[PDB]
Subunit: 387 residues, 4 copies
Amino acid sequence: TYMNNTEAICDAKGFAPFSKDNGIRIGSRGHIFVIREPFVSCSPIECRTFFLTQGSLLNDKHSNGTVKDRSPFRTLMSVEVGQSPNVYQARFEAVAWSATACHDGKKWMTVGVTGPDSKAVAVIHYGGVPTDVVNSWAGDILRTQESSCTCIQGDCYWVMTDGPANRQAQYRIYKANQGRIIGQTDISFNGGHIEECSCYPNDGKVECVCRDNWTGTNRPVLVISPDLSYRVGYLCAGIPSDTPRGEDTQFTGSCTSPMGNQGYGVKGFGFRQGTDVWMGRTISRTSRSGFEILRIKNGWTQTSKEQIRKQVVVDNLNWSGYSGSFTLPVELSGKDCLVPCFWVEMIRGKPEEKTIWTSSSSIVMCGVDYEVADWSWHDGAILPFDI
Amino acid sequence: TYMNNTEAICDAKGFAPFSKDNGIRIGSRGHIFVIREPFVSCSPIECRTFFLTQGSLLNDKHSNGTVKDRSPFRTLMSVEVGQSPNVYQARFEAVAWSATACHDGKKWMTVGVTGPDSKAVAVIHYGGVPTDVVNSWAGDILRTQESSCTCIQGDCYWVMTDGPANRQAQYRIYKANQGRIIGQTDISFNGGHIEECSCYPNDGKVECVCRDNWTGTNRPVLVISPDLSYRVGYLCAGIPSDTPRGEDTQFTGSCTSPMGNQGYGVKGFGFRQGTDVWMGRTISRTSRSGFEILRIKNGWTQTSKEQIRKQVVVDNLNWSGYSGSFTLPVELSGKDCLVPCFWVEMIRGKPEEKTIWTSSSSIVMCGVDYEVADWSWHDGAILPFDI
Amino acid sequence: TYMNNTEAICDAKGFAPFSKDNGIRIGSRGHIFVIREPFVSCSPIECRTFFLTQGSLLNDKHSNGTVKDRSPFRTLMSVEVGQSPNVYQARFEAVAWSATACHDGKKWMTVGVTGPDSKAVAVIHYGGVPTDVVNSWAGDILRTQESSCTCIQGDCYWVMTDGPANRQAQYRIYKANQGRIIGQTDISFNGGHIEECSCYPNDGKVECVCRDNWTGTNRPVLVISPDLSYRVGYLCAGIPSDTPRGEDTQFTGSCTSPMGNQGYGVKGFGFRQGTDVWMGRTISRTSRSGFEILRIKNGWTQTSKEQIRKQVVVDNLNWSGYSGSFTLPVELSGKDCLVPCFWVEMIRGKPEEKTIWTSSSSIVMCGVDYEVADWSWHDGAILPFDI
Amino acid sequence: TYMNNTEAICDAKGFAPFSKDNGIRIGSRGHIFVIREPFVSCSPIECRTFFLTQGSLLNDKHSNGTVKDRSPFRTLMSVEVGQSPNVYQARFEAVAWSATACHDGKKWMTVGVTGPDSKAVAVIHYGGVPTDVVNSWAGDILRTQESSCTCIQGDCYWVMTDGPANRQAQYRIYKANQGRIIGQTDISFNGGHIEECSCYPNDGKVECVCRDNWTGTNRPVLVISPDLSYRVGYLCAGIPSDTPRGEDTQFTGSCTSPMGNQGYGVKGFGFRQGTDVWMGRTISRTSRSGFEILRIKNGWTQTSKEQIRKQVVVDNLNWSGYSGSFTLPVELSGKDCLVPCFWVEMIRGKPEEKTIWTSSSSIVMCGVDYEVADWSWHDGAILPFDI
Ligand SMILES: CC(=O)N[C@H]1[C@H]([C@@H](O)[C@H](O)CO)OC(C(=O)O)=C(C/C=C/c2ccccc2)[C@@H]1O
Ligand SMILES: CC(=O)N[C@H]1[C@H]([C@@H](O)[C@H](O)CO)OC(C(=O)O)=C(C/C=C/c2ccccc2)[C@@H]1O
Ligand SMILES: CC(=O)N[C@H]1[C@H]([C@@H](O)[C@H](O)CO)OC(C(=O)O)=C(C/C=C/c2ccccc2)[C@@H]1O
Ligand SMILES: CC(=O)N[C@H]1[C@H]([C@@H](O)[C@H](O)CO)OC(C(=O)O)=C(C/C=C/c2ccccc2)[C@@H]1O
Ligand SMILES: [Ca+2]
Ligand SMILES: [Ca+2]
Ligand SMILES: [Ca+2]
Ligand SMILES: [Ca+2]
């Protein structure tokens, strides 16, 4: 039975802790994969943490990070949300140095890009087998969300980028049913730049807040209709939500074009709330440390900088990193609306710490009807490790 | 299908061993969480050990206990009753430095309190997702049972405390259906003090024997009707059942008020038997060592000190600690009545042993139709460990 | 749906390897329980290895065997047949320093005896919970099969011994339905001695070949009708099948009384074949080394020493030990008859090897329509271990 | 419900990565079996990696390879495709130093040959139990595919060899239903030589490309009709596909007889494509290093050397080894045709590397509608290990 994700996103005063896996502390002695980009997606029955494995284990010579991001040993695997990315509970998903995964109601669909940078291959899995394939259309590191993809009425949608990391690239929407690609569209977005989209179903369409790694501190935003018509631009709110970024007071927002004169970036998320936005961001405007979620009044549709609520979840004394979006299925939450939820990756080791290795642990938050007090559910590992 | 827990508690001559997990001995070489407060609750199909993890593993630097009780790395997880709290069979439940869990017949409901002491948050999970939330109402370490909660006809009930550990605090009953709080009541109990309740269903109402950490050596007792009307007071029997406590002969019992002039305490349990009580208690009146269960004639309703049966389960040469209550569902035991069962936590390491770490193993006993001989199913680990 | 075990035992020319767990070799680096007495019983859907754990792990200080056989840390757990007794795939069964387990078609029933030698308690589990209890009736180490028990038409039967290890003791049959004891009978057997019975269903009754630890080199044999009437005596064949034992040529068989003037013994098995017997035995008549299965013509009902077939399975250069019986359910094998199967425990470490510890691995053989060549599927661990 | 494998093999432009287990890198610290011959077979619901375990673990004294290939500690076990052959997720299949496994739609059938070389025994398992047996018919190391077997309409077929490794031997087809052998035929093939067949269902018959270890660089090929009539010979294409082998230009192909004057060999695969062939082969013509798949036009039925497509999957700088065939069931892929898929074993350690041990990791590729770029998904372990 196909999941209907046609409802509106729940309006939410605050965010409550869902889980915390404790990957790295546990991996001081347990058998834990060295991972990065640990996103969450939910099936009608259970939510799971997916993650790229570097194919090695914490506290072992193979975690020696000289090993490439985009290596043949990089696999997409998963476990249940809140469990560490450990070998003995891991489920194999796909070979991928960049990934997206989402469940439609019957089965899991996953998309793992691997292979050489000039002609990468993306295998689409459905229910545990390859079902279809996308090739590099631009010969420059084919990539995708690193976050849950979005299934509405049996059809699953996702965004992909082919091209340079720091100048104009090419961006596409892709549409599958039961693991077969059944539609796709280029995204006309000049000067603009889109990477690592964080999407969620909302009102029968698909909203993503993604990353601009070229010019913009604000995040690109698109809304994909079921016929892969779309609208694209930037999260309107007059507050930079990327990293690095300039201070809030030196930033004029825009619904149209990038703002800020910085390159680089980091993956983030945002949730539409009527016309408001819940937008996540690192606390540091410089590095990937600390994490907070601001609610800007009218920020989805205005250059507003009127802030209703702010809730710290990782304090500025602790490393954070990637963040992404997903919803709770109605069939799990009880609600008549789609509960917004996010995860926050917390990076330990290189480049900011003196270890041979790099990995991350995560924490997942879900949208509730109440204000939740500020806190810091930071990673917690005692660095360095035995090496 | 909802579990009916409306039956009476089985009248039981004695207690038979259900399980013994051997957590700490096993964790000398295996991959075992460092845990505390390892209670048991049963679903129509299986009983499980829940436990707070300190997020680290035995024989590892992160077990270094300087780490706070109420830390962001403290998670509620579980395994099947009798299995050790090991990583590779663990199921994630919630982020919580204080927890309660119970199954209603369809799904598991869990409640994990985490966050800062001045405004703690309790996320209610249902079937593996956050469904509702309680906030600190008194700004002083929001807490709960550390024992199975109680589901009668689909609705699950539990007790919570907001306030000081050593003077008057505030106590509430809470009532959920399918993860949504649908009712709650304050508990008018002045001079009295309630913490870490050990509840069980009995006669269509909910009976808890809880801990008074302020004035009383005897245990508070409440009986919650389905409309959250209640009665509250103390276990009548003229025998102190807390720790520390005075000797039996210097103690006049009371159904109304605390007795003994000691502060402190430890979590314990008791089971109504018509008018008698099966009351558990440490053997030492000073420290948490050894464990025994006395049956006092008319002790539920009298100041009686008439003891019918006594059964040692952990001898005074061995560490014990927390204890709690739960029943076997009819759908599991075969019986027309609710089998009383308890667990006993057995604490090793700090503060009484010279290790860096502290954890505990457990043993579960269930009510039977026969006298069972005294014995000691103590923890057994050979301290200290490699460190 | 209840298993009918009313069929006849399959007539079988030979025995084929079912499994080999490799427990001890694997436990040189893996996380493997230190075990003894690893028997097998089958459910309509899967066969499992049960085993007493000493509660510790190979290559760890807690395996230090000074630890008692009959300790409070001794638990009955299980895994699927052929898998090692490892922590992360183990299922908890009961607290027991002596055990029997068997499946009736709906659920697993297990029986774990634990507690003090003067008044031991046997908890009967059904579907994962205590359901009933037997107490010491003779105050001298209550014990049982260490082998699969036998379920015919929903009712499960097993044999127990209360008394001395080396002179007359007391022996009982016990009969459960759904975990409730519903019948029992004393076994009038003077001068005779019964321990550690190896039973199997055959022709709607229950046949056990058990061990006499007092006087007899030949094995006691009983046949339990559904009304717990019985016949008891000795396996007729004129060949000693216990260990230690005298040579075949100095042994006159008997259907009635023990023969041989030795005390001691070891657990073994035998399978009726019309009037023949398949009888297992160590190769060494002195120690527990090597294993073979002889088919004696008319040996169930005669003092015969006419040997049709012999098949070595563990050679005299390798340690063996315990052996037991069980059948394959029709619902698994396809056959219209009950396939005889046995397991052979293979003991490493103390007393015969210079280690601190003692454990064993196993191998399971099933009855087939062909002669199978002699071989040795011995344990294989390289002793001693890191200690 | 029985799987229909009666469809034609999908015509496929290229091969996409299915999985990569990372066994050996992971086994630098994790608990990983030392394995060889890690093939894949699929059930209607999931594909699994089967493998011979040497019964020991990486980084342990028991991996010390002096241990025989054909030892009593050699077991067939399995895990889900893409997961490493680790102890805690392993499922026991059979005792076997040579194996084949395949699922018919209802259950798994496995065939494990073990025992002495002069009279080896092959136990057939069905749904987890021994159901039937084949004995050595030629007294010279009874062996089989090391690759998925083939189930068409409930009946499963497989090829076996009894005889010398380097001169004429004997070869048989075998046909089971529900674990009972129900048919078999000798394969009249003089001068020819057949070992380690790699089969797949195609057009309602069974096609195997196998290994000739006597005279031929080209691979034997057979096509087994459901009545075990057959045709046998050699893959026609004028290109040697074994290892070692001569260069392509010095090789005249044949549909009839072996070509090349070399002994030895290694297991490989091939897939019929109408009249073309997808044939796999090591890159090195000398050693087992690198892996590629050529599509020869008309190569199934001609001496053609017209090459349409070539796709490297493991580069000549990296060890490869065994390869085998299997299909995706329609009930998994969605397709109206049978998706060709193969796996490639990647051997580390002895004989080519300076370690005490030998094992291998694998990677699985499935047939798709597109050209996939060359790459190398090599094993990746950093040799030697701690030993
Ligand atoms: C496809 C890819 O490699 N994406 C990068 C991505 C970056 O290249 C741009 O978004 C594309 O222009 O950015 C980052 C990043 O910003 O940190 C990552 C995440 C790093 C994973 C990692 C870290 C340490 C060792 C191995 C892998 C990703 O691996
Ligand atoms: C919510 C809380 O922290 N409760 C305490 C509780 C105590 O604070 C009072 O009941 C509230 O007034 O008491 C105890 C206790 O009496 O020992 C505990 C249990 C200790 C868990 C622990 C032990 C060592 C290291 C880390 C955690 C609990 O952690
Ligand atoms: C109930 C019991 O303890 N049975 C013994 C049993 C023996 O006492 C007689 O049968 C009863 O009279 O015999 C044996 C035996 O003959 O070896 C055992 C098995 C030993 C298990 C063990 C070995 C080493 C360390 C810990 C336990 C059993 O543990
Ligand atoms: C049945 C058997 O032993 N087959 C061999 C097989 C070889 O004997 C011929 O095909 C039969 O004539 O060939 C090979 C091979 O060509 O390498 C193997 C695979 C080796 C497994 C292994 C490697 C190292 C240590 C232990 C086992 C197989 O083990
Ligand atoms: Ca940027
Ligand atoms: Ca007190
Ligand atoms: Ca004897
Ligand atoms: Ca050859």
